[PDB]
From a paper:
Here, using a pseudotype virus entry assay, we found that NeoCoV and its close relative, PDF-2180, can efficiently bind to and use specific bat angiotensin-converting enzyme 2 (ACE2) orthologues and, less favourably, human ACE2 as entry receptors through their receptor-binding domains (RBDs) on the spike (S) proteins. We determined the cryo-electron microscopy (cryo-EM) structures of the PDF-2180 spike trimer as well as of the NeoCoV and PDF-2180 RBDs bound to Pipistrellus pipistrellus ACE2, revealing a binding mode that is distinct from that observed for SARS-CoV-2 and NL63. Cryo-electron microscopy analysis revealed an RBD–ACE2 binding interface involving protein–glycan interactions, distinct from those of other known ACE2-using coronaviruses. Our structural analysis indicates that NeoCoV and PDF-2180 bind to an apical side surface of ACE2, which is largely different from the surface engaged by other ACE2-using coronaviruses.
To understand the antigenic landscape of these ACE2-using bat merbecoviruses and provide a blueprint for vaccine design, we determined a cryo-EM structure of the prefusion PDF-2180 spike trimer. 3D classification of the data revealed the presence of a single conformation corresponding to a closed trimer for which we determined a structure at a resolution of 2.5 Å. The PDF-2180 S1 and S2 subunits are similar to the MERS-CoV equivalent subunits with which they can be superimposed with a root‐mean‐square distance of 2.8 Å and 1.4 Å for 566 and 443 aligned residues, respectively, reflecting their degree of sequence conservation. Although both spikes contain a furin-cleavage site at the S1–S2 junction, processing during synthesis was detected for MERS-CoV but not for PDF-2180 S pseudotyped virions. As the stem helix is strictly conserved between MERS-CoV, PDF-2180 and NeoCoV S, we assessed the ability of these two monoclonal antibodies to block PDF-2180 and NeoCoV S-mediated entry. Moreover, the strict architectural conservation of the fusion peptide region between PDF-2180 and MERS-CoV explains that recently described monoclonal antibodies targeting this motif neutralize PDF-2180 S pseudovirus as well. Collectively, these data underscore that the conservation of the fusion machinery between NeoCoV, PDF-2180 and MERS-CoV S is associated with the retention of inhibitory activity of several stem-helix- and fusion-peptide-directed broadly neutralizing betacoronavirus antibodies, some of which have been shown to reduce the viral burden in small-animal challenge models.
Residue numbers in the entry:
A (entry chain C): 51 to 92
B (entry chain A): 942 to 950, 952 to 1215
C (entry chain A): 348 to 621, 626 to 695, 703 to 793
D (entry chain C): 794 to 872, 877 to 905, 913 to 950, 952 to 1139
E (entry chain B): 1041 to 1090
The structure:
């Protein structure tokens, strides 16, 4: 599952670099706890 | 009326009033803070002269070096600034083409007039809101200061405070109040030592022959080697003025014996004989 | 003194220590920096067949240098409708990307292709996006430029689908979906609805042509959208600002104007130890330039200058709060004209650097010129009319208590008054405010 | 705090500076409002330390308290002008260093370096730490001797003797004090010395010191942070407005940005004034407690703490004073 | 006064201006509310002390 506490699947902003801050953003993110579809190759 | 009630405001309770001369009130006020009666009687002319100097000095005191006075002018200036802000901010053009509604109406069409007038209104509403909010902040300030003034009228003027700091510096004797712009002006007359002497004092004295019979000073100190300066020389002084006098039952109280009390043989005080 | 007067708007100020604003911190010279890449090739805009509105072309330009004069010098501009940008600015800014959409379209129909409309021109063909700054340019392109307009030019007038007849409407920045284009291209040009299946879903589509409205000077619409993402500019102009330097070293230690990768303003640059560096309040405080050097960036007003003023003598002195006196000489160019000259002396204090003071062991009782940290300015005894003089740099007096020492006895020392005076403590209490 | 209003609002841009004239002498008013507020803070200090100031004192030496351990209160320079508790208090409260001396040079933390970018400055206090410490040191040395009617004399009485008289004055007989004098000193020492480990998260008086510090920080955060706001404008940057829009929309957009920056400054001044009134009230309270709890023995209930008041001590704290009231608390009754 | 009315009446550019006007007023109201609660909190602190 997506773990928001590890920032899983989070896309970093495409402009400046941010540091030692908290930013409030509305954007395309995965839902926390979401189980994606698993695909297997062999 | 407040001035006329100072001398008579004496005993427990606030129910009675004594028509006591001001001068008598001052001498009792001084006695109550440690100055003995012999001192007050010998120096009564000196006390009146020093008091008069200190109080009459105020006739030339309302200057730029007088902080209490400048504070009166500042209160006045504060009120003036609040009004300056209502009167002056009307001339502002808050993103509009003009501070004048009439100029907007005669220059722009009916649609831009609404936008421009709204800009001008918003600024004028802001000014009024800012004015009300400060008056409210200043009202809370006044509520606090009005409360303080009440406490000082009741504690410094209508009575004699024993609280340090409150009612001014030094030992409080008497306060007077006159009106001031936007408030009250207090004048607290205090007693301020100008020169000091250090002497050695006892916590109390005991009869060496009768160790259970011990005394302690009231409103003063038992000090040694000041008068005659021989063996077991102990005398009493008021705590607010050095003036050694014989130890008598009027200057003392009987107390339980303590390890810090002196044991005396010679020239034993009358309360111990 | 004049900065003090203008900061407060008062020619007759009281004595005190006042903060002041700067009135001489003007830029001298300027620095420009931008990326250099290959040209943003715009051939496809002018030297091909014009696109239709239902199938318009889009090209996104990144990591290149553009020339807007080149686009405009080729066409006759009928109109332009810009939003959060102007053609003047469009020509010179740096962008994360530049996008151009274009198609043939009659000038006479410019009101259909408009911000408040919701005609079939907008709903099924071209719906301009407004989330990014953009400008819609209506222009006539002459055949001498290589522009051609063969084939049928058409737009979708309808494209509903399913059993609910749901209009397959184009979303801002999008285009007619493949089902709509497939349908419309097989539809009659008389505006008639044609029905077909696209995969498993039934579609009803129709189109009209505008080929008959296109003439030798071809009416074209070019929509230029620019993205701003500070720190990620890849698209810059080929033209460098006329009065700006392209080498910063000769401008260091000075207040200059600048334009660095789209970021403009004034400031002072210094060479520092290590593309934009930000603080926690989104201010740029340094950058990495293309010559490999890292620079610190400060406003031309960075030193917290305050003025100590005595209104009896009209004398004044300056405090540069929290600044070491070594650094003051180097910043002289941003201070008042008379400060600059005097710096081309200084005492270091615990509150900053002071100019116009002399050292003194004198202390102050009533301190109306406090500098802070128990420091007090002591006014000169000479009036300015005679000449300028310095303030003593003294301190707030500590009037210590009498020291009466205790005895290792059963007895104790007591300090008693031998003489006495009366004093009056004056106090003002404000009990109400003006109603 | 003082603010370079012109810089705060226009950041060096001439077009903004001209548009700003349409708001009247806005910056002059801000400069005067802040100047006035700052003068008041210095007056609060001058009057507070008039109460702290003693006429006479007995010099502090080690062993000052006799049987009573006051080591934590005496100056380190006796056993630094500051006491062990006051150093401990200042070391456990988290405070950014204002950089009063050469702070500009260090920045060439963020609310401090923001001063030289945003256009505002944190000002130093009237008194330095040594002077304030000297005042509380002298106050400590006057407690034992502050006895009779009147405030004119001073008695150089050992602290231990003062405590025993203070206890006798509240109903404990002399036989009891004599029999239990070792017990009294031990219990007192326990209660007072406990403070060495008291500056923790369970100590409300202590957390209140940190909160005062945080409050000042938040006020500055609002000046430093609100500059980044785009108040209906296309950008927070005047430079970005000028280089993107034409000369007419620039005026509208710059005015939007100015209005927001003027609003921020007005909000800042108004809170400083509300907080100045708060300080005026609290400074008054501190004066009453110095004169009534420390320089004397209060008989007032509640005032000077819970239980029966015996003695108070004062050390300096960030933005104020820290009072420690030692009271007598019955633990078992008959 | 309704955001919904702005969105359904104006185009996407004027909506931003109009919504910003409406937001600014609502932010102002909230700021005014907080500032008075703070002024009234100081009043209460004084009266609680009394
Ligand atoms: C941007 O493009 C313009 C063309 O629109 C360039 O200007 C031309 O320069 C040539 C010489 O190389 C002249 O013969 C043309 O007459 C000019 N045309 C116009 C309209 O001025 C311009 O030099 C280009 N800018 C840069 C930086 O390369
Ligand atoms: C008493 O005073 C005299 C005169 O100063 C001095 O010589 C004598 O030693 C003193 N005696 C005592 C016990 O202090
Ligand atoms: C006085 O005598 C009493 C009783 O013997 C003793 O307790 C006390 O310590 C003595 N004090 C002095 C000052 O000698
Ligand atoms: C520009 O693009 C065209 C295709 O539209 C191509 O033929 C031409 O060679 C390109 N020129 C350059 C310099 O890339
Ligand atoms: C338009 O193109 C034609 C044909 O190439 C040419 O003869 C004519 O000069 C051009 N006119 C303009 C205005 O460019
Ligand atoms: C800038 O000019 C200096 C001489 O003033 C020169 O030494 C330096 O190499 C130049 N830098 C660049 C990037 O051209
Ligand atoms: C102040 O006193 C110190 C004592 O060492 C001395 O060195 C210094 O020169 C004096 N300065 C002045 C201005 O009196
Ligand atoms: C007290 O001081 C005053 C003023 O110096 C002086 O005139 C007077 O003689 C003094 N009296 C005594 C008791 O020393
Ligand atoms: C007094 O208290 C200090 C801590 O402030 C401690 O280190 C010292 O040992 C104590 N001394 C005695 C005699 O209790």
């Amino acid at each position: 599952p997506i773990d928001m506490n590890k920032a899983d699947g989070v896309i970093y902003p495409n402009g400046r670099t941010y540091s030692n801050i908290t930013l409030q953003t509305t954007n395309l993110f995965p839902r926390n706890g979401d189980l994606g579809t698993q695909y297997v190759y062999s | 009326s407040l001035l006329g009630s100072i001398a008579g405001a004496w005993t427990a309770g606030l129910s009675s009033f004594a028509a006591i001369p001001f001068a008598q009130s001052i001498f009792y006020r001084l006695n109550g803070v440690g100055i003995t009666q012999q001192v007050l009687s010998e120096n009564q002319k000196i006390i009146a002269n020093k008091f008069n100097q200190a109080l009459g000095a105020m006739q030339t005191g309302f200057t730029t070096t007088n902080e209490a006075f400048q504070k009166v002018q500042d209160a006045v200036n504060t009120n003036a600034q609040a009004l300056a802000k209502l009167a002056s901010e009307l001339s502002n053009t808050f993103g509009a083409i003009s501070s004048s509604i009439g100029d907007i109406i005669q220059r722009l069409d009916v649609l831009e007039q609404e936008v421009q007038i709204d800009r001008l209104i918003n600024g004028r509403l802001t000014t009024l809101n800012a004015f009300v909010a400060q008056q409210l902040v200043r009202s809370e300030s006044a509520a606090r200061s009005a409360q303080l003034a009440k406490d000082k009228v009741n504690e410094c003027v209508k009575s004699q405070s024993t609280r340090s700091g409150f009612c001014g510096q030094g030992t409080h004797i008497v306060s007077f109040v006159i009106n001031a712009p936007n408030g009250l002006y207090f004048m607290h007359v205090g007693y301020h030592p100008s020169q000091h002497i250090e002497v050695v004092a006892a916590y109390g004295l005991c009869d060496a022959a009768n160790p259970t019979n011990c005394i302690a000073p009231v409103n003063g100190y038992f000090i040694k080697n000041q008068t005659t300066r021989g063996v077991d020389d102990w005398s009493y002084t008021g705590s607010s003025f050095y003036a050694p006098e014989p130890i008598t039952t009027l200057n003392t109280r009987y107390v339980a014996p303590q390890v810090t009390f002196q044991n005396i043989s010679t020239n034993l005080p009358p309360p111990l004989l | 003194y004049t900065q003090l007067v203008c900061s407060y708007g008062d020619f007759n100020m009281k004595s005190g220590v006042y903060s002041t604003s700067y009135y001489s911190a003007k830029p001298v010279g300027a620095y420009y920096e931008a990326h250099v890449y290959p040209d943003c090739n715009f051939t496809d805009l002018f030297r091909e067949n014009a696109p239709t509105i239902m199938q318009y072309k889009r090209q996104v330009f990144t990591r290149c240098n553009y020339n807007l004069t080149l686009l405009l010098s080729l066409v006759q501009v009928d109109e332009f409708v810009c939003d959060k940008i102007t053609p003047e600015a469009l020509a010179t800014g740096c962008y994360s990307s530049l996008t151009v959409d274009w198609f043939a379209f009659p000038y006479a129909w410019k009101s259909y292709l408009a911000i408040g409309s919701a005609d079939r021109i907008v709903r099924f063909n071209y719906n301009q996006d407004y989330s990014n700054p953009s400008c819609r340019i209506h222009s006539k392109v002459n055949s001498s430029v290589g522009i051609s307009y063969s084939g049928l030019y058409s737009y979708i007038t309808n494209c509903n689908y399913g059993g609910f007849n749901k209009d397959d409407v184009v979303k801002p920045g999008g285009r007619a979906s493949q089902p709509c284009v497939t349908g419309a291209l097989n539809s009659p040009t008389n505006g008639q609805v044609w029905s077909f299946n696209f995969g498993g879903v039934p579609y009803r589509t129709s189109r009209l042509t505008y080929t008959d409205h296109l003439k030798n000077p071809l009416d074209m619409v070019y929509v230029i959208t620019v993205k701003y993402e500070p720190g990620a500019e890849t698209v810059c102009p080929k033209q460098v600002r006329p009065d700006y330097s392209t080498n910063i070293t000769g401008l260091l230690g000075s207040c200059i104007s600048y334009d660095i990768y789209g970021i403009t303003g004034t400031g002072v640059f210094q060479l520092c130890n290590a593309k934009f560096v930000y603080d926690k309040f989104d201010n740029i405080i340094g950058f990495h330039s293309d010559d490999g050097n890292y620079y610190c960036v400060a406003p031309c007003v960075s030193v917290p200058v305050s003025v100590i003023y005595d209104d009896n003598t009209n004398q004044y002195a300056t405090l540069f709060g929290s600044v070491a006196c070594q650094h003051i000489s180097t910043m002289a160019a941003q201070f008042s004209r008379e400060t600059r000259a005097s710096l081309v002396n200084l005492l270091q204090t615990s509150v900053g650097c002071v100019m116009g003071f002399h050292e003194t062991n004198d202390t102050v009782e009533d301190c109306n010129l406090s500098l802070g940290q128990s420091l007090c300015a002591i006014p000169p005894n000479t009036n300015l009319r005679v000449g300028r003089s310095t303030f003593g740099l003294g301190s707030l007096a500590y009037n210590s208590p009498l020291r009466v020492d205790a005895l290792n006895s059963s007895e104790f020392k007591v300090s008693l008054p031998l003489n006495f005076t009366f004093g009056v403590t004056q106090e003002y209490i404000e009990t109400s405010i003006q109603k | 705090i003082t603010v370079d209003c012109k810089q705060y609002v226009c950041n060096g841009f001439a077009k903004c500076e001209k548009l700003l004239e349409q708001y009247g002498q806005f910056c002059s008013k801000i400069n005067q409002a802040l100047h006035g507020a700052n003068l008041r803070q210095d007056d609060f200090v001058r009057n507070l330390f008039e109460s702290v100031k003693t006429p006479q004192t007995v010099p502090l030496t080690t062993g000052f308290g006799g049987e009573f351990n006051l080591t934590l209160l005496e100056p380190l320079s006796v056993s630094n002008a500051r006491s062990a508790l006051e150093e401990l208090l200042f070391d456990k409260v988290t405070i950014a260093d204002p950089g009063y001396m050469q702070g500009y040079d260090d920045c060439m933390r963020d609310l401090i370096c923001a001063q030289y970018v945003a256009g505002y400055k944190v000002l130093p206090p009237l008194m330095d730490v040594n002077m304030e410490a000297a005042y509380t040191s002298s106050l400590l040395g006057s407690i034992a001797g502050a006895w009779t009617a009147g405030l004119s004399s001073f008695a150089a009485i050992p602290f231990a003797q003062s405590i025993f008289y203070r206890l006798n004055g509240v109903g404990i007989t002399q036989q009891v004090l004599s029999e239990n004098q070792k017990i009294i000193a031990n219990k007192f020492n326990q209660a007072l010395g406990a403070m060495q480990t008291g500056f923790t998260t369970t100590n409300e008086a202590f957390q209140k010191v940190q909160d005062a510090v945080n409050t000042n920080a938040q006020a500055l955060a609002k000046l430093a942070s609100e500059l980044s706001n785009t108040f209906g404008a296309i950008s927070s940057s005047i430079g970005d407005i000028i280089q993107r829009l034409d000369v007419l929309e620039q005026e509208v957009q710059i005015d939007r940005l100015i209005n927001g920056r003027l609003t921020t400054l007005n909000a800042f001044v108004a809170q400083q004034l509300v907080r100045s009134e708060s300080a005026a009230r609290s400074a008054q309270l501190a004066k009453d407690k110095v004169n009534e709890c420390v320089k004397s023995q209060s008989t007032r209930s509640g005032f000077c703490g819970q239980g029966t008041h015996i003695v108070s001590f004062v050390i300096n704290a960030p933005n104020g004073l820290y009072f420690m009231h030692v009271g007598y608390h019955p633990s078992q009754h008959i």
